[PDB]
Amino acid sequence: PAEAKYYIAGTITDATTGQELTTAKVTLGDKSVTSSFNEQVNYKAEGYALVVSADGYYPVKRQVYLNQVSDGQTSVATVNVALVSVEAAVIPPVVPPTDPETDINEGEATKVADKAVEVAKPSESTVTDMLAGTTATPEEKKALDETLEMAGGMKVGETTPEVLADGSILAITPVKFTNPIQDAPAMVPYFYNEGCELTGDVKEVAAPVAVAADIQKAFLSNAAKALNMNAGFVQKIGYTRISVLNGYSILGYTIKGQLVSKKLTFLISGKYYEGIVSYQKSVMIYPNYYS
Numbered sequence: 001p002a003e004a005k006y007y008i009a010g011t012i013t014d015a016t017t018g019q020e021l022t023t024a025k026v027t028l029g030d031k032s033v034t035s036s037f038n039e040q041v042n043y044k045a046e047g048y049a050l051v052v053s054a055d056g057y058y059p060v061k062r063q064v065y066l067n068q069v070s071d072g073q074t075s076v077a078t079v080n081v082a083l084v085s086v087e088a089a090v091i092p093p094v095v096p097p098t099d100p101e102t103d104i105n106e107g108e109a110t111k112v113a114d115k116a117v118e119v120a121k122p123s124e125s126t127v128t129d130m131l132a133g134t135t136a137t138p139e140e141k142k143a144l145d146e147t148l149e150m151a152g153g154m155k156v157g158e159t160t161p162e163v164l165a166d167g168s169i170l171a172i173t174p175v176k177f178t179n180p181i182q183d184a185p186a187m188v189p190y191f192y193n194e195g196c197e198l199t200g201d202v203k204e205v206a207a208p209v210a211v212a213a214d215i216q217k218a219f220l221s222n223a224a225k226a227l228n229m230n231a232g233f234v235q236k237i238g239y240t241r242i243s244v245l246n247g248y249s250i251l252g253y254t255i256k257g258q259l260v261s262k263k264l265t266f267l268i269s270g271k272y273y274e275g276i277v278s279y280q281k282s283v284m285i286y287p288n289y290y291s
Helices: 106-120 123-132 138-151 213-227
Strands: 003-014 024-030 029-035 036-041 048-053 060-064 075-085 155-156 161-162 168-183 186-194 196-198 234-242 249-268 271-290
Touching: 003 186, 003 234, 024 036, 029 036, 029 138, 048 075, 060 075, 075 186, 075 234, 106 161, 106 168, 106 249, 106 271, 123 155, 123 186, 123 234, 138 168, 138 186, 138 234, 138 271, 168 186, 186 249, 186 271, 196 213, 213 249, 213 271, 234 271
Parallel strands: 003 075
Antiparallel strands: 003 036, 024 029, 024 048, 048 060, 075 271, 155 168, 161 168, 168 249, 186 234, 196 271, 249 271
Protein backbone atom coordinates (compact mmCIF):
# COMPACT_ATOMS: atom_id res chain seq x y z
CA PRO A 1 0.00 0.00 0.00
CA ALA A 2 1.35 3.49 -0.97
CA GLU A 3 2.52 5.83 1.81
CA ALA A 4 0.40 8.85 2.90
CA LYS A 5 0.81 11.69 0.32
CA TYR A 6 0.89 15.37 1.53
CA TYR A 7 0.20 18.63 -0.34
CA ILE A 8 -0.02 22.35 0.49
CA ALA A 9 -2.37 24.18 -1.94
CA GLY A 10 -3.60 27.72 -1.88
CA THR A 11 -4.06 31.19 -3.24
CA ILE A 12 -2.79 34.66 -2.38
CA THR A 13 -5.55 37.25 -2.86
CA ASP A 14 -6.40 40.89 -2.08
CA ALA A 15 -8.50 40.95 1.17
CA THR A 16 -10.81 43.68 -0.32
CA THR A 17 -11.37 42.57 -3.95
CA GLY A 18 -10.82 38.85 -3.60
CA GLN A 19 -8.74 38.84 -6.80
CA GLU A 20 -5.47 36.88 -6.98
CA LEU A 21 -2.32 38.99 -6.23
CA THR A 22 -0.11 37.68 -9.09
CA THR A 23 2.82 40.01 -8.17
CA ALA A 24 2.91 38.77 -4.52
CA LYS A 25 6.31 37.40 -3.36
CA VAL A 26 5.59 33.95 -1.85
CA THR A 27 7.91 31.33 -0.31
CA LEU A 28 6.66 27.97 1.01
CA GLY A 29 9.43 26.40 3.03
CA ASP A 30 12.63 26.95 1.06
CA LYS A 31 10.76 27.27 -2.32
CA SER A 32 9.68 30.34 -4.32
CA VAL A 33 6.05 29.75 -5.47
CA THR A 34 3.45 31.75 -7.42
CA SER A 35 0.25 33.26 -5.97
CA SER A 36 -1.61 30.05 -7.01
CA PHE A 37 0.46 27.16 -5.57
CA ASN A 38 0.12 23.40 -5.12
CA GLU A 39 3.21 21.63 -3.74
CA GLN A 40 3.78 18.05 -2.69
CA VAL A 41 5.65 17.93 0.63
CA ASN A 42 7.03 15.34 3.07
CA TYR A 43 5.29 15.13 6.46
CA LYS A 44 7.06 17.31 9.08
CA ALA A 45 5.67 17.98 12.57
CA GLU A 46 7.35 21.44 12.36
CA GLY A 47 5.12 22.35 9.39
CA TYR A 48 6.15 24.71 6.59
CA ALA A 49 6.65 28.49 6.73
CA LEU A 50 4.47 30.37 4.19
CA VAL A 51 5.89 33.93 3.82
CA VAL A 52 3.88 36.44 1.75
CA SER A 53 4.45 40.09 0.85
CA ALA A 54 3.26 42.61 -1.81
CA ASP A 55 3.93 46.34 -2.23
CA GLY A 56 1.10 48.29 -0.60
CA TYR A 57 -0.07 45.42 1.62
CA TYR A 58 0.83 44.22 5.10
CA PRO A 59 3.04 41.10 4.91
CA VAL A 60 1.78 37.74 6.34
CA LYS A 61 3.72 34.73 7.75
CA ARG A 62 1.71 31.55 8.42
CA GLN A 63 3.03 28.18 9.61
CA VAL A 64 1.25 25.46 7.60
CA TYR A 65 0.73 22.14 9.42
CA LEU A 66 -0.22 18.86 7.82
CA ASN A 67 -3.20 16.76 8.99
CA GLN A 68 -1.65 13.24 9.24
CA VAL A 69 -3.36 10.43 7.29
CA SER A 70 -2.56 6.70 6.70
CA ASP A 71 -1.30 4.52 3.82
CA GLY A 72 -3.11 5.12 0.52
CA GLN A 73 -4.64 8.44 1.73
CA THR A 74 -3.91 12.01 0.65
CA SER A 75 -3.99 15.12 2.88
CA VAL A 76 -3.95 18.69 1.52
CA ALA A 77 -3.29 21.75 3.75
CA THR A 78 -5.68 24.34 2.14
CA VAL A 79 -4.39 27.92 2.56
CA ASN A 80 -5.94 31.26 1.51
CA VAL A 81 -3.78 34.22 2.48
CA ALA A 82 -5.67 37.44 1.72
CA LEU A 83 -3.39 40.49 2.15
CA VAL A 84 -4.85 43.69 3.58
CA SER A 85 -3.95 46.98 1.86
CA VAL A 86 -2.15 49.56 4.02
CA GLU A 87 -5.02 51.89 2.91
CA ALA A 88 -7.98 49.57 3.89
CA ALA A 89 -10.30 50.65 6.79
CA VAL A 90 -10.37 47.72 9.22
CA ILE A 91 -12.26 47.36 12.55
CA PRO A 92 -9.99 45.17 14.70
CA PRO A 93 -11.53 42.31 16.73
CA VAL A 94 -11.53 42.72 20.58
CA VAL A 95 -9.06 39.72 20.69
CA PRO A 96 -7.25 38.40 17.54
CA PRO A 97 -7.76 34.84 16.19
CA THR A 98 -4.35 33.82 17.68
CA ASP A 99 -5.87 34.21 21.16
CA PRO A 100 -7.14 30.83 22.54
CA GLU A 101 -10.32 32.61 23.79
CA THR A 102 -11.38 32.64 20.10
CA ASP A 103 -11.32 28.81 19.76
CA ILE A 104 -14.68 27.00 19.89
CA ASN A 105 -15.47 23.74 21.67
CA GLU A 106 -17.45 20.67 20.58
CA GLY A 107 -20.81 22.00 21.86
CA GLU A 108 -20.45 25.22 19.87
CA ALA A 109 -19.28 23.22 16.80
CA THR A 110 -22.48 21.09 17.04
CA LYS A 111 -24.66 24.26 16.86
CA VAL A 112 -22.96 25.59 13.70
CA ALA A 113 -22.35 22.20 11.93
CA ASP A 114 -25.45 22.19 9.68
CA LYS A 115 -24.79 25.70 8.45
CA ALA A 116 -21.03 24.98 8.00
CA VAL A 117 -21.79 21.93 5.81
CA GLU A 118 -24.44 23.87 3.80
CA VAL A 119 -21.83 26.52 2.78
CA ALA A 120 -18.87 24.04 2.54
CA LYS A 121 -20.58 21.41 0.32
CA PRO A 122 -19.56 21.30 -3.33
CA SER A 123 -21.75 23.49 -5.55
CA GLU A 124 -23.27 22.25 -8.80
CA SER A 125 -20.63 24.03 -10.96
CA THR A 126 -17.84 22.58 -8.70
CA VAL A 127 -19.16 19.01 -9.16
CA THR A 128 -19.48 19.63 -12.94
CA ASP A 129 -15.84 20.85 -13.12
CA MET A 130 -14.50 18.08 -10.85
CA LEU A 131 -15.95 15.45 -13.26
CA ALA A 132 -15.18 17.23 -16.54
CA GLY A 133 -11.55 18.03 -15.54
CA THR A 134 -12.03 21.75 -16.36
CA THR A 135 -9.11 22.90 -14.19
CA ALA A 136 -6.92 19.72 -14.53
CA THR A 137 -3.43 19.69 -16.04
CA PRO A 138 -3.10 17.67 -19.31
CA GLU A 139 -1.60 14.64 -17.48
CA GLU A 140 -4.39 14.75 -14.83
CA LYS A 141 -7.10 15.12 -17.50
CA LYS A 142 -5.77 12.07 -19.36
CA ALA A 143 -5.59 10.03 -16.12
CA LEU A 144 -9.11 11.24 -15.06
CA ASP A 145 -10.53 10.22 -18.48
CA GLU A 146 -8.97 6.72 -18.19
CA THR A 147 -10.43 6.46 -14.63
CA LEU A 148 -13.92 7.48 -15.81
CA GLU A 149 -13.67 5.00 -18.65
CA MET A 150 -13.06 2.11 -16.18
CA ALA A 151 -15.47 3.42 -13.49
CA GLY A 152 -18.24 4.43 -15.98
CA GLY A 153 -18.90 7.56 -13.94
CA MET A 154 -18.66 9.12 -10.45
CA LYS A 155 -21.68 10.11 -8.33
CA VAL A 156 -20.92 12.85 -5.70
CA GLY A 157 -23.12 12.03 -2.69
CA GLU A 158 -24.72 14.25 -0.04
CA THR A 159 -22.27 16.17 2.19
CA THR A 160 -22.82 15.37 5.90
CA PRO A 161 -21.25 16.86 9.09
CA GLU A 162 -19.05 14.96 11.57
CA VAL A 163 -18.30 17.11 14.67
CA LEU A 164 -14.93 16.28 16.34
CA ALA A 165 -14.23 16.63 20.05
CA ASP A 166 -11.67 19.47 19.48
CA GLY A 167 -14.35 21.72 17.85
CA SER A 168 -13.36 21.01 14.22
CA ILE A 169 -16.11 19.89 11.84
CA LEU A 170 -15.56 17.40 8.98
CA ALA A 171 -17.66 17.96 5.82
CA ILE A 172 -17.92 14.36 4.57
CA THR A 173 -18.53 14.14 0.77
CA PRO A 174 -18.73 10.50 -0.50
CA VAL A 175 -17.86 9.79 -4.17
CA LYS A 176 -19.08 6.45 -5.58
CA PHE A 177 -17.87 4.84 -8.82
CA THR A 178 -20.66 3.41 -11.00
CA ASN A 179 -18.47 0.26 -11.46
CA PRO A 180 -15.65 -0.55 -9.07
CA ILE A 181 -12.14 -0.26 -10.65
CA GLN A 182 -10.42 -3.64 -10.56
CA ASP A 183 -6.59 -3.96 -10.46
CA ALA A 184 -5.95 -0.39 -11.72
CA PRO A 185 -5.11 3.02 -10.21
CA ALA A 186 -7.58 5.98 -10.25
CA MET A 187 -7.06 9.75 -10.71
CA VAL A 188 -9.87 11.40 -8.77
CA PRO A 189 -11.14 14.92 -8.09
CA TYR A 190 -11.37 16.65 -4.71
CA PHE A 191 -12.46 20.17 -3.83
CA TYR A 192 -11.90 22.66 -1.03
CA ASN A 193 -13.08 26.08 0.07
CA GLU A 194 -10.95 29.25 0.21
CA GLY A 195 -12.14 32.08 2.45
CA CYS A 196 -14.35 32.24 5.52
CA GLU A 197 -18.09 32.17 6.14
CA LEU A 198 -20.34 33.13 8.97
CA THR A 199 -21.63 29.78 10.36
CA GLY A 200 -23.17 30.95 13.65
CA ASP A 201 -25.59 33.78 14.37
CA VAL A 202 -24.19 37.28 14.97
CA LYS A 203 -25.58 38.40 18.37
CA GLU A 204 -25.29 41.62 20.37
CA VAL A 205 -23.07 41.00 23.46
CA ALA A 206 -24.89 42.06 26.68
CA ALA A 207 -28.08 43.32 24.93
CA PRO A 208 -30.73 45.02 27.22
CA VAL A 209 -34.21 43.36 27.75
CA ALA A 210 -32.31 39.65 15.31
CA VAL A 211 -29.21 41.57 13.94
CA ALA A 212 -29.47 43.69 10.73
CA ALA A 213 -27.91 42.47 7.42
CA ASP A 214 -25.43 45.37 7.17
CA ILE A 215 -24.04 44.60 10.70
CA GLN A 216 -23.67 40.94 9.68
CA LYS A 217 -21.85 41.95 6.48
CA ALA A 218 -19.54 44.33 8.45
CA PHE A 219 -18.92 41.52 11.00
CA LEU A 220 -17.93 38.96 8.30
CA SER A 221 -15.87 41.53 6.42
CA ASN A 222 -13.80 42.40 9.51
CA ALA A 223 -13.63 38.73 10.64
CA ALA A 224 -12.12 37.87 7.19
CA LYS A 225 -9.49 40.69 7.52
CA ALA A 226 -8.57 39.47 11.04
CA LEU A 227 -8.09 35.97 9.61
CA ASN A 228 -6.27 37.19 6.38
CA MET A 229 -8.88 35.41 4.24
CA ASN A 230 -11.53 36.45 1.72
CA ALA A 231 -15.09 36.95 3.00
CA GLY A 232 -17.17 34.09 1.45
CA PHE A 233 -16.07 30.72 0.11
CA VAL A 234 -14.65 30.26 -3.38
CA GLN A 235 -14.26 26.60 -4.33
CA LYS A 236 -11.04 25.09 -5.73
CA ILE A 237 -10.49 21.69 -7.36
CA GLY A 238 -7.52 19.28 -7.27
CA TYR A 239 -6.74 15.76 -8.55
CA THR A 240 -4.95 12.92 -6.68
CA ARG A 241 -4.07 9.28 -7.37
CA ILE A 242 -5.58 6.29 -5.60
CA SER A 243 -2.96 3.55 -6.09
CA VAL A 244 -3.66 -0.13 -6.80
CA LEU A 245 -4.00 -2.31 -3.64
CA ASN A 246 -3.60 -5.95 -4.85
CA GLY A 247 -6.64 -8.14 -4.21
CA TYR A 248 -8.97 -5.14 -3.76
CA SER A 249 -11.06 -3.07 -6.18
CA ILE A 250 -11.61 0.71 -5.68
CA LEU A 251 -15.33 1.36 -5.02
CA GLY A 252 -14.76 5.09 -4.78
CA TYR A 253 -13.59 7.44 -2.06
CA THR A 254 -14.56 9.97 0.59
CA ILE A 255 -13.53 13.62 0.66
CA LYS A 256 -13.20 14.90 4.24
CA GLY A 257 -13.01 18.70 4.59
CA GLN A 258 -11.70 19.97 7.95
CA LEU A 259 -13.62 23.11 8.94
CA VAL A 260 -12.04 25.10 11.80
CA SER A 261 -13.99 27.89 13.55
CA LYS A 262 -13.39 31.09 15.55
CA LYS A 263 -15.62 33.12 17.87
CA LEU A 264 -14.77 36.82 17.34
CA THR A 265 -16.13 40.08 18.78
CA PHE A 266 -16.27 43.45 17.01
CA LEU A 267 -17.45 46.91 18.12
CA ILE A 268 -19.69 47.87 15.09
CA SER A 269 -21.64 51.19 15.20
CA GLY A 270 -21.28 51.58 19.00
CA LYS A 271 -22.43 48.02 19.96
CA TYR A 272 -20.45 44.81 20.49
CA TYR A 273 -21.35 41.82 18.31
CA GLU A 274 -20.12 38.23 18.47
CA GLY A 275 -20.36 35.37 16.00
CA ILE A 276 -18.70 32.22 14.78
CA VAL A 277 -16.92 32.10 11.41
CA SER A 278 -15.53 28.96 9.74
CA TYR A 279 -12.82 28.18 7.17
CA GLN A 280 -11.18 25.10 5.68
CA LYS A 281 -7.74 24.07 7.01
CA SER A 282 -7.48 20.80 5.03
CA VAL A 283 -9.01 18.32 2.66
CA MET A 284 -8.31 14.60 2.92
CA ILE A 285 -8.99 11.83 0.38
CA TYR A 286 -9.86 8.38 1.78
CA PRO A 287 -10.04 5.54 -0.80
CA ASN A 288 -12.78 2.93 -0.34
CA TYR A 289 -11.08 -0.40 -1.09
CA TYR A 290 -13.19 -3.62 -1.27
CA SER A 291 -11.96 -7.26 -1.04
